[PDB]
Every structure is written in structure tokens, then in C-alpha cells.
Symmetry: D2
Subunit: 493 residues, 4 copies
């Protein structure tokens, strides 16, 4: 991994509309902070409804029948998505460092994980551009019926701050591959990298208006997109709380298509026959990954009684060794929580757990006096009714529950409003299969966790979402089907 620049230059910090950078109509700006220090990195333009409106107009124009983007070859769309990937790889070290600076996650991770996954995502959807065929349908009568899978139109895409570059990639990949136009609202906590990529979009040769990126706040620029009378589809990734708002906004207005990838409280079921060493390390990763700031985190580790104590002993030991520190330090495994708000938020949960009567196995407190660092906390002997066993903590706080039978664990694991993911650690074939099928989750990892693939769909089962976001499934939400039934002289098979 290339040596990063612990202070990457911030080259772009405005609103990107029509391959041009401009300030907010109000000239307002908001600060972005480096979570590791608490110092302001720079000031980004504060987009609002006016800027959203301007962007939507730009996007609508770019989507007009006969525009370069509409007329462009599907193959060339894939070409552009690949060119974008190339530029991103060219600037891999810069983007990784900027990501870590803006987000807090370990540089090594931003580089080897995030950027790799961004590249693999864009490159994956570049190949889908000219392969998402429609169908010729054998209708009754003397007709020739077929379907056109055309773009849904102007797509509003709102993303969170946990995986800035990646969440952007997840949205842009299928949207652009299907020939859609975009008006994206990036998280105010981490806007720096998306803006840089926005410029790479221009450099890649994307037609003006195709991708519009607007930095700003939620109920401001985000809501402006959600209830816009000219945004055809909205893709939202964030809190379940805001998810409700997004959906309600669509109903009250444009009646635009909605897809939501939201919160979770994923159960991590460990059976007695599970390989301990593996089950332990993966259980650690499943929850602490990305400062515990992951939607599909295994927030409820259900360990079978026969191995509970042992597992617990090992989980605590691993949490005890987990190195928290400067994101840029090669040996730092845990960086700071994205921001103070999230910092105090997490601590509030640690407080709740202790108060509701939980076995605090690892120190639940700040790890430093400067950045927003929190100690890898592990709570033992959890009860389903406890807040920390119900609510998404989104911080390095592990919950370890004990179960006896599978009949029992299935019911318990499924007893949640969330249903984004789950995992099963077992050596037995039948137990793996039975559980996979019984768990009401968008993704069930067997003998592993957090395994993401551009080719495999991701999504929620209940209040954790609707619609899938990767693979061929990711193209569906970005397609408007058109049936054309033509009368023919005489139909034949």
C-alpha cells in the first residue's frame, strides 16, 4: 500500500452541476471536520432546494430524447464507466487518503477495501450497459409484442457517510449503466471525496447534466430531491427514520419510484459445531468493522450455550487487543467515529446498556481526549428487551446473547423490525441450509460475514429497506419497461 499524504489537498468543494463548479445560490458554506483531530478540514458549499432545482433542470435537459446521452450507445456508456474507474484507480492513493481524512477509517482499509470495492463496482456495471435486454413476448393474436427497458428518468440519489466513495459507486453504477441522469445529495459529514469523483466524471467524458453532485444537509437538499415534482426516482441509503420521510415525500408529490437501503440489527448465529477461532474473529469483524458503523453489522451475537462462556472470553480478549488510533498509522485497526454527534450517540448507548443491566466486559468510554475515539465495548449476557439489543448502535459496541435451540434462535433472531442481514457459523450442512432459509434477511452469510460482491444483491427485508442494490437486481429499480404491441398481418411461431 502506497504511503499516503496525511494531509491530502482538497481541490473541489462546491456544487457540481453541468460539469461546472459553482457556489450555492445563497453563497453559504458548511465546514467538514477530520474526526481524528476535530479540526476543520475545509468549507464546502451548502446546497439547498434552489441548487437542487437548478440541478434537476440540468438533469432533465440531459435526459431529453435526442440528447448525446440518450442517443449514446449502451456500449459507450460502459466505456465511460470504465474510463471513470481508470481515473479513480489512477488517483487511488489520493482518494484513499482523502477518504480517511474526511471519514476517519484506517487508510489501509480505505485503500485495500473501499477503493478496491469502488473500482470493482463501477467496472462491474460498465459491463451491464449493453446486456440488460428487454423481451419479445409470444402474445395471443396476430401481434408482435415486445418490451423496451428504458431509463426511468431523472434519478435522485441520497447517500450516508459510512462508506462515502462506495455508496456513491453503488448508486452511480446501475444508474449510469441503464442510461439514467443523476442528481445526487452527498452526506454533509463526508462530502470531499464524492466531489473529487464528480470532477473525474467530467474528465471521463460524461455529457453535461448526466451526473450532478450537491453537497449539503439532509432536511434541506435531501428533502428537496425527495419531494421534487420532476425527480422520477429516488434511491435512499441512510436511517430508517428518514426512510419513512423519503417514502412519505414521494407519495405526497411526484409519486416517484422509491427504493430504500436502511438500518439494521443483524443477528450473528454461532452454533456449537462452529470453528471457534474463525467464528470468533469473524464475529469480531462483523460488529467492529468500520468503527462499528455498518448497516449490516452483526449487532446481536447469539452464541449457543455450550460454547457461550468460551466464545465470550475470546471475544473480550480480541476487543481488548483491537488497536484504536490514528487512521494513517499502519497498525491502527479502529479510527474515530465520523463525528461528535455520532460520538455522543454511541456513548449514550453504552450508558443505556450498563443501566439496563448488562455485563460490560470491555471498557465503554472514550479512548482519547482529542478525536472522537471510543473503546471497543463488549456487553455480555444480553436480553432481547434491552435497548442496545433492539436499537442500531452504529458504534464499536458488541452485544452477546446466549441461545439453546435453533427453533429458539430462529424465532429470536427474526424477532426484529430490521432484516438487512444475518449470518450462520456451522460445519453442518443441514443446519446451514435450514437457517439460511429461515432467517428473514436480505443477506445471510454462512461461515463468513460482510462479504460484498458487485454481482450479489444487497437489501432489507422489513424496516431495513426495499429493493436490492447490487448485481443484475440493481438495474431493475433504474428501468422503466415499455410494452409495444404491433398488429401484424399473420403471426406464426
Amino acid at each position: 500500500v502506497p504511503t499516503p499524504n496525511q494531509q491530502p489537498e482538497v481541490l473541489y468543494n462546491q456544487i457540481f452541476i453541468n460539469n461546472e463548479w459553482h457556489d450555492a445560490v445563497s453563497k453559504k458554506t458548511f465546514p467538514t471536520v477530520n474526526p481524528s483531530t476535530g479540526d476543520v478540514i475545509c468549507h464546502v458549499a451548502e446546497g439547498d432546494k434552489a441548487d437542487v432545482d437548478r440541478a434537476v433542470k440540468a438533469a432533465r435537459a440531459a435526459f431529453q430524447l435526442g440528447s448525446p446521452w440518450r442517443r449514446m450507445d449502451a456500449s459507450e456508456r460502459g466505456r465511460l464507466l470504465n474510463r471513470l474507474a481508470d481515473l479513480i484507480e489512477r488517483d487511488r492513493t489520493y482518494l484513499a487518503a482523502l477518504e480517511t481524512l474526511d471519514n476517519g477509517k484506517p487508510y489501509i482499509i480505505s485503500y485495500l477495501v473501499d477503493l478496491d470495492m469502488v473500482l470493482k463496482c463501477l467496472r462491474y456495471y460498465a459491463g451491464w450497459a449493453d446486456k440488460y435486454h428487454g423481451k419479445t413476448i409470444p402474445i395471443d393474436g396476430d401481434y408482435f409484442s415486445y418490451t423496451r427497458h428504458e431509463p426511468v428518468g431523472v434519478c435522485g440519489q441520497i447517500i450516508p457517510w459510512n462508506f462515502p466513495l462506495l455508496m456513491q459507486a453503488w448508486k452511480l453504477g446501475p444508474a449510469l449503466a441503464t442510461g439514467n441522469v443523476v442528481v445526487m445529495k452527498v452526506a454533509e459529514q463526508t462530502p470531499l471525496t464524492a466531489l473529487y469523483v464528480a470532477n473525474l466524471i467530467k474528465e471521463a467524458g460524461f455529457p453535461p447534466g448526466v451526473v450532478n453532485v450537491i453537497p449539503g444537509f439532509g432536511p434541506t437538499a435531501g428533502a428537496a430531491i425527495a419531494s421534487h415534482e420532476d425527480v422520477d426516482k429516488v434511491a435512499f441509503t441512510g436511517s430508517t427514520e428518514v426512510g419513512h420521510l423519503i417514502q412519505v415525500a414521494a407519495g405526497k408529490s411526484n409519486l416517484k419510484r422509491v427504493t430504500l437501503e436502511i438500518g439494521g440489527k443483524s443477528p450473528n448465529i454461532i452454533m456449537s459445531d462452529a470453528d471457534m477461532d474463525w467464528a470468533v474473529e469473524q464475529a469480531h469483524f462483523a460488529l467492529f468493522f468500520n468503527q462499528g458503523q455498518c448497516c449490516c453489522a452483526g449487532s446481536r451475537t447469539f452464541v449457543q450455550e455450550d460454547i457461550y462462556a468460551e466464545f465470550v472470553e475470546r471475544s473480550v480478549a480480541r476487543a481488548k487487543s483491537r488497536v484504536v488510533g490514528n487512521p494513517f498509522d499502519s497498525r491502527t485497526e479502529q479510527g474515530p467515529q465520523v463525528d461528535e454527534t455520532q460520538f455522543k450517540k454511541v456513548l449514550g448507548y453504552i450508558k443505556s446498556g450498563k443501566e439496563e443491566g448488562l455485563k460490560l466486559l470491555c471498557g465503554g468510554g472514550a479512548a482519547a481526549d482529542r478525536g472522537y475515539f471510543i473503546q471497543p465495548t463488549v456487553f455480555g449476557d444480553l436480553q432481547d428487551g434491552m435497548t442496545i439489543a433492539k436499537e442500531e448502535i452504529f458504534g464499536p459496541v458488541m452485544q452477546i446473547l446466549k441461545f439453546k435451540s435453533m427453533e429458539e434462535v430462529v424465532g429470536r433472531a427474526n424477532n426484529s423490525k430490521y432484516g438487512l442481514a444475518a449470518a450462520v457459523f456451522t460445519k453442518d450442512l443441514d443446519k446451514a441450509n435450514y437457517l439460511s432459509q429461515a432467517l428473514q434477511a436480505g443477506t445471510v452469510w454462512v461461515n463468513c460475514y460482510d462479504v460484498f460482491g458487485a454481482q450479489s444483491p444487497f437489501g432489507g427485508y422489513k424496516l431495513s429497506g426495499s429493493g436490492r442494490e447490487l448485481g443484475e437486481y440493481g438495474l431493475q429499480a433504474y428501468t422503466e419497461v415499455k410494452t409495444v404491441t404491433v398488429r401484424v398481418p399473420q403471426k406464426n411461431s
Copy 2:
């Protein structure tokens, strides 16, 4: 066509839950009227939230992992759907007669069109039960990734009164084929036929709880389903106005999946090289079909100037010959409008058109003093800004507009909030191709209209809906994808 019984006996008039008939919790009932006479056919149980809740519980139970329906083989689901089809065909004369008595549409149509389309739909989806495969995905790393296309859960389906039996079949086919459970709310204006088929479902051998039919009112039983914390998905077909409500209800509550098949103001573009005889008859059919009570009706007939006068003269002549009368009379082409409220509503539009300054070419008034009959009205020389040229009349009121160029007609045709369908009559290949691609509609009929096929998707492009309802596409909304990524010792191609 078998001679019907002008007065079919109403055998079922209660709430169907768990293969059993019960009265409403409140014991309240509401009358159902025969639009041809204005007399009450009988009184149906008035379902409300309480009944909806009891139906949802029955549905949830039927969906329980390990229940007969869950464990049932996909093939047997197809068997049950076919069995249902057979029983419906067995009772074809009865159901067509009852349909006509409760709805108003001509008996010949109920029999040859509706009932035929009902059978073709169910029989089509019976074949999909065991064929909607999931996928094995070539993911990166040593894993085995695949997807499970599982049922979405408890499906709430709300249908209108224009095609009672058909709208029900449109909903039940894909829902049942995919292994889902149903809580259906039937239109208060025409509940009788749905209830009969409800019992046929029991007789077919469908497990109790799988399909629950609730007769009642909209803001009552309908809203109860839309905002239910235990209904996983809602499928709505009705007005765009109510559609907003359905979507907002979902966001404020369960965040359930939503699909909307709503209103329209479909344009019927007639080019000068169109075969007159055909273009005229089909343009007549396009708007007057089913008492003009059709979502995708060609409510805006744009005739190219070069043939405008001639076309209009023939349109009016055709309207003048259109026989309005007793739906049971074999020569009756037009029955009465579903109910007085719709009656008064249609006349209100004829009034608007006149006042807005339109060429009333065919008498716009009642056609009788008994039932709810209205004269096949034809308005000529319409202007896009006129209400009747903007709003969905849903009655036998034809609007004929004139255009010069295609560039112009494309823009005008597309100038609408709706986008459910459209059609183009031409002998020219390039004009057919160009327009079909240019019209923002879920269905574009070329040289025909109202051609529906169980195998071809149907849906709206803007405020006319979201999601498709037929063909393979009709299965999507009823599927919940599950990605199972299993770690393997060593992956190989």
C-alpha cells in the same frame, strides 16, 4: 354464448377469511346496486379495520414457515391456480351474468372478453409457479453465492370496479404463483363476483388464510390495509388521487413495498397514412370500451389535419350508431355507468367540455330515465388546455384533437402527468418505430388498441403508476430476494 340468467342468485355476500364466511365485526352491511335499474341487488358485509386485522392475522398464520402453503411445492401452487381456472370456467355463464348484473357491462362482453381474460390470466400464472428461478452468482473469492426468490409475505391488494373479476385475477395470479398470502379489498360498487371466486378458491383446495377477500369501503377497509404494520406489500389499482394516499400510508407505517396501477389520459395518434376504416373503429373502441371506464382509454385522439375532418365525420357517425341499452340484450354495445356518482361525474365533464368551448358533435346527456345510461358523446376541435382534454373522464366521452407534425404530436402527447398507454396508427415502419420509442407510456399499441396479454406487462410512466402488472414482470413485485453467500474450501469456475 350461452343464454344467461337475467337475475343470477347471489350466493355469497360476507367477509371471506380462512376459507369461511363471517359477517363484519360490526354486523354492518352496505347495498350493492344494479346500474341498469338503480335497484339494490343485495347487501354485502361492510368490512373495516377490525376485519382487516383479523384477515391479516389469518394471512400471517398461513405464511408461517412450515405451513402447508409455505411447504407446498411450487408445481402444486400452479396446480391449484389451474384448478381455480377450471372451476371459474365451469361457472362461466353464472359469473359473466353476475358481473353484468353488478357492473353494467354487456353480458356478451363479460362472457367473451372478461371471463376469457380471467381464465387466460390465472392459467398463465399457474405456469410461472415453478419457473421464476433465482440465481447462482459468480462472486469473487472462495464463496458460493446464490439468490432465493422468496415470497414478500402478506400482500394487501386493493382493486377498482371497472373489471371486477379481471382486476382480481390480475392480483391473485402473480401473488399466489409466487407463494404469497393475500388480504384483498374489493370495490364497494362491485363486490359480488369477487366473493364468489373467493369461495371457488376454497373449493379449489387452497389452504385457509392464503386468500382473504374483504368487501367494504375505501378510506375504511382499504386504508386499514395500506397502513397496516403487518402487511408486507400493497398492490393498488384505482385513482391517482388515492394512489398518493396509499404511498404516503406505506411511508408513515410499515414501509411496505408499494406498486400502483392508476389513472390515465392515453393519447391515440392517427397519422395520415393510417387505414381510415380501421383507425376509426379502433379509435372508437379505444375510448368507448367498457362504458369508457378504462384506465388506458384513448382519451386524446390526435388526428393529423390532412384527415381530421373525414376522421371526425366517421367518428361521430360511429358514436351515433353505438347501441346503449340493457346489458343482457345481445345487441347492446353500451351498458350503464357503474353507479350514479360516476353518472353525475361523467355528465359533469360533458358540461365542462361544452362550457370550455368545445364542439359537441354527439349528444352529451343521459340516454334513459332509469339506469345510469349516458349518450356516446364526441367532442371535436379540442384544446390541450381544456379540462376534458386533461382530466380522466372515465365515461363515454370522446375527445378529438388535431395535429400537424410528428415532432409536435410527440410533445403534446407526452404533455401529461399520466403515462399509462398510447397508440399510433400508421402503415409506415419508421413512423411506427420512432413514435413507439418517443411516447412516454407503459404500453404503446401500434395499429391496434386495448390489446392485453397475460404475457405482456402493463403499467404507468408517471402519475399513472409504478411497477408492471403482467407477464414475468408481474412476479417481481411479489418477490423478496435473499442472497446466501457460503464460504467454500476452494472456488473454481
Copy 3:
């Protein structure tokens, strides 16, 4: 199971062409024998090239563009396939008894297994008729490219005698569902049942010429189809030896499409962790099923040393209790071998095994002096180089080999020219996964054997075939793709 008629009346015994029964052009006939007695059931007309040519002519005519069959709705094709299934079910008792009478297999099997699987197959493909869509392709340039999945043409289908009715159904289902015409050659050992179904085809309402069934001999009628200048595609199921002949014939002549489903030597790998009770019973079933006359039979039972002795002991015990007798007796598990030729052939193999130096664990000799009955033989301590461990015996002769490691078993199991199927019995997830992927077989059963599903494909990996025969895959070989690229004034997404 309905009490059969020990002596079913043979109603049809000629050549079926154009919904009509006629004798062979030569008026020749050949006898069909009841293997349980050795007595002639009746005499069937002997078709040859002359009759095949007449049939092909009939088929070609029925395939003419504009014929009722070509113009027929895809849904109607499905309707006809369903009608055929219904009639077959109506005559289930008769067909089962006739099957047993002419084949030898136990009546209970013919009824509960064969006939059920025939119904399930036809019913499955009925649903495929109107669902095998083509595609609209997003080609570069101003074009509208799409594909038509049309019938391949005149299909010659040659079947074996092991599962008469079933093999017929496997061929007819996909052929007719895709709109093709048929020229079928039925096994001279068991032509009776196929002929009866042939007439049910007529009764179902199938257009004349669409399905032509020709009873006769191999190098006679079979070869006549194989090298016919007007047969578009040949589907063969038989011996690997004849398979070579069929493909060579195609290349020599019409260059028609070829698919072969041939012989096997399927390995059954039982690992130490396997549940004995089940592994032993399924291992018994995997080999002895249908008088050991099954292409995918587990002809090489590789038992892991740690449980070899124990396993063998039980295999033998089960072999010893295996009831061989009158197919019509409820207690009969094993009927006679199809015919004398196969009887002597099987005995030859038992002879071989003994001479090759094998542990004869169960008597390898005739079980009666009347019909063609053979004692369920079990050979222990087999060596890969032994003929009985190499060649397809096709009789109740069990081979039990011993293995130590997976690495070793994989290589050994794969060391065969055949590759039709394999099975793995384990409780371990990783072993199941690893083996499934490592075994070069068209079907790998895990913890079960001979599990067939109309929805899952079946086929060979090497000298055991080419192409798949069930599920959606079974439609491929019966489809001819046509790309239509039309010039459009202006292409848009």
C-alpha cells in the same frame, strides 16, 4: 394404488402419422414380449425408412408457415399439453399396467413413480409454451435489434426402453411447448405405451402431423431419422455406442442439431460422517432402482474405509431381503429385466466380475426359470480396472469400492469416460460443497439419489451426453434464434 388389470388390452399397435394408424409400408410386424413370462404380448408394425420418410413429410407439412400449428397461440400449445396430461391421468391405471406388462417394472412403481413423473413433466412444459421469451438487444447505432426464438423445425426423437412413457414425455414436453413437430422412434422392446399416448395426442386435439410415433428397430427406423435430409434436429437417448452413430449420421447428412443423453457409471461417494441408515438405503436404491436399469445408477459405491466393512455388511443384508417377483404383486420390489438379451447380458457381467476376482457377496444368478429374473447381486472390494467397475451393467449388480481420502476419491470418481451423475453423502457443509464442484457430472445428488425434477436439468459431461434435457434448459435445443436488426430514424435509450 388402484388394482390393475394383470392383462391390459392392447388397443394400438401400428404406426401413428397424421393422427392416423396404418401398417408399415412392408406390412411387416415384430413381436413385443412380456419379460415376466417370456410370452409374446402382441405384434407391432415394423416401421423402416419408408415409413420414416412418410412421417417426415407429414411433419414438414404440419410445420408449414401458416399451418394451424405454426399459427396456434403459444398459450394454446400449453393448453393442448395440459389436455394431454389430463387424458393420461384419466388412463393412469391402464397405462401403468400396460407399462409394467411390456417393461417388467413393478406396477406400483409404474403407477406412483413413472406415471406421476410423466404427468409432472408434461404439465411443467405446458407452462413454458408462452414464457420462453426472446430479447430486445441494445445494439450500437441507429437500429432496433431483437431476437425471435422460433421452432427448430422437424424434430426426430429416439428413445430407449427403460422408462418408455417417461422418456417419451421428456422429449414431447419441450418439443411441443416450443412449437416444433415430431417424428418419434420408440424402442422396439417396449412400444405399446408410446402408441397409446400417441392416440391420446390425437384425442387431445393436436393438429395432424405435429406428433408422429413410429414403432420399429434401431439401425432401421432410428438410423433413417438420424441421417434424414429433412429432419432439422435429432434428440437421442440410448447407448453411447449408438450415440457416436447418431452424431456421425448428422454430420454425414443434413448437418442437423444433435443432443445425446446416453450411458453412465455414476459414482456414489459415502464419507465416514454419512448417516449409515440413510446412506445404505439410498445406496441400495441408487443402484437397484428399476431392475438396475437406470442410466444414472450409482454403479460405483465408494465407501470410506472407516465405515466400509459396516456399510458392506448392511448393503448385502438389504440386497438379500430385496423381493424379486411378479411386478403385479404389491410386495414385489424387483421385477424382471426387460428382455432375454438384457438378461443374458447382465449375467455375463456377473460372470465377468467373478472371473476378474471379485467378492461375490450376493448370489449372482437367475432368480427364476420363467421370466427374466436376476438375483440382486453385490460385489465387494472392487478395483477400478475391473470390467464391472468400468462398464455399464444396467442390471441389479452392485459394485462396492473402498477409498481413503477425498483427494483420492475425487480423482477416482472422475476417472471415467462417462459423466452423467454422482452423489455424495455427508453431514459436513465443506465436504458437500467441495465434492459437488469437483465431480465432473451433469447431476450431483447430496444426501439423496435419483431425485428428478421437471424443473431441474439432466445430462452428461463426457461420453454420457451433450445438452440438458429438463427445466428451461430443455427448451434451448428446440429453439432456433433469429436476429432482426431494423434501421431506425434515431435510436434512444
Copy 4:
């Protein structure tokens, strides 16, 4: 178009096996000639059975389970294909020049057409690598059935000389995208470019043994692959004559999978309402393109009598202006015929036509005394029974036939053993629709010709082939389906 090097350096002229260049086992070589001069470009190694065997071994090893290639991620396969495309583009000018030097086609065409199509094809299939999913099948009973789309194995691919680089790309694209290994036999008349790309494969980072290129002769190296006991599948593109041989070879040997892309005699139907200017130029292109050396050339131009005379007059004038000359001259439209053998072969046909009694409208003779140049010949008033109207000329010799009705032209156009392509020029929608469905051709071009797209399949209907070569269809032939049915404790929907 960059100025080429009229004498590009030949850097590679040996056999490529294991990313290494070696001479033939016999040390024999054969000359490769420049058709424009008749002078020898250089000497290439003459591969034979021995070298094929060597290559097969290399490929077999590269395909071993656990190999870098077998273990490689499908995405990485796509990455390698894209890497190869980049290297090919990097050397576009060199490759174009070398292609022209060894083939004879105009440099401008090699550059803007051939190389462009080469890049487009490879880049297209790069995207397929991780997208050709298998499926999870809803089988009956307590099982989990799914399919694995695995590589077929060692693929032998034999290509002709008309589009050297492109034919290679058509084979390599799907083969490599699906994870297969290759043993390719390149045309003795034009081996130079394939060999250079062979080295670029090495440079791209492809594992050794994955692609082996062998220059040599047909009945020698070609047949050695066709009848190899270890080549799992053979893909052939060449003459129908040799096609028979290839298929026969497969049947006599390994029983390997076969796909043939062979000769044609495509009809070009021009209706009276066809735009003359366009129909005339397209008709010219359709036959003369690539020195008339194109499999799907419109060698039977059926002009509707009403426009016959006029069309012919225009066709002749066009042929009369067609510039034949030095392939490297910007003004050259027609280069020399690949080789003397083909040169005399074409002249033989011109002699035939004259003798058969045809209207020689344009000089049917050599165009120069140096290279292999032939004058753009046009024969008028052709009769279906004439040799030149039946046999593939494969040179610049146009056949113009006259027809009266559609019914007539359909039957005539279809009266051929070939069925590779066809075209229809009409302004009428119904005529276009009717004919497209009526013509038995793998591709029917409407108002255009020779329009190829990596996304749309190409193939023959009769003696012109079997199987398709582009789009998703191109992956089918390179996939081996494996059904894995696992027993599960309890199956649920």
C-alpha cells in the same frame, strides 16, 4: 485514420503454446503471401497433429481444478479481456496495416471497421465474465436444487481468412469470458495478425496454457483438433463442405460439442416501395463488401419487377465506379482477393454464369496483372437454377433476380440449403414484419445490411451453421451445466 506503414514488420511467425513461441515439431514452415502483389510476406511455422497434441496438453493442464485460471475471479477474467482490448487498441495502426498486408482488404476498412469491431467484441464479452449466472430451481420435495454454469473444458477453435482478427475475437471473447481454455487453428492464408494478438494475450497477463494459437493447414492441424480425444468442444467457421467433416470427426471420436458457422447465399429482397438511392447503395455494399468475401453477403438480390430495370441500371453504374486498387490507397474501395486459389475460383464462377446464360452487365475479368484483383462483376436476370444463383461465389460477383409477389419471393428466397442471413428493404410496416418472420435466416436486416453488433447473435438456419455466435447466446456453447440437488431438512418457499 493514421497513416499506416505499407510494410509492417512481422514480429511473430511460430506456434504459440504456454505463452511461448516454438517452431513446429517438424521444423516445417509455409509461406504467407500478400494478395496485392503475389510476393511472399514471410514464412510461418507449419503446425500439425504433434503440435496440436502439445497444445491440447498445455490447455488441459491450464484447465486443472485449482489452476490459476480455474481459481481466478470471473471479474478478473473480464479484466484480462479488457487489458487485451487496450493492448490491441494501442497497436491498432500496426494491426490494421498487418491485416491488410496479409489479407488484401483496404487499410481504411481494417482500421475503422475490423479493428473497431475487434475491440468492441472483446470489450463486450469482458462484461459477461461475471454475469452469466446459473439458477436456483424450485424443485419438488425437500431439496435445494441449483445449477452451475461451468466451462466446457478444452476448446478447439478453427477460423477462416476473410476477417482474421475479428474471427479470432468472436471465438476468444466467449471462450475466455466463460473460463474456458483454447487451442486455436488459424487460417493458413492469413496467420500473421492472430499470432501477434497471441503475444498480446501473454502481455495482458493471461495464464500460460489458456490460449494456444497454432498456424498451419486444414486437413492437418485443423482435423487434428476436430478428432482429438481430449478437445471437449469445437467451434468451426469456414465452408459447409468442411463443416460436415468437423461434425463427422466429433461423432467418430470424443463425441465433443460442435458449433458451426458456415457458408451462405443470403437473399436481398427489395420491394417496390423501397427508397431506391439507399436500397441501391446498400445492395452494392451487401455483396461487394470485403471483396465479396463475406459469409452473409447478399448474393441473391431479388428486385421487384416494377423497379427492376431502374435498380439494375443503378447497380451496374455503382459497380462501374467501384475503385479497385492498392489496399493502402485512401481511394481504394476494393482490394485483391485473399489468394490465387480464390482468384481463379471466383473467375470460374464468372465463367459459369456467362455459360449458364446470364446478362453480364459488368466486366467479369481480372482487374490487374499483379495481385489477385477482379473487376466488380454484375449479372442481370438470373435464374434460381443457375450455379452462380445457387453456390457461394465469395468474390465481387453480383446476382440480380426479379420477383413479382411476396408470396413468390418468400418461397424462392427460402429455397436454399443455406440460411445465414437475409434482408428486406421496404417503407411498409406490415411487409417488413411479415417478411422478417417468413425468411428462414439467422439474421434478417430491415432497411440495412451487414449490421453486426457484439450484443446481437449471428448464425445459420440450415447448411449454413448451427448455434449462435454473439450476444449472450455466444456464451451458451461454452458452458457446461451442472445440477446439484441437495437434501434439506425441510423445504419452504
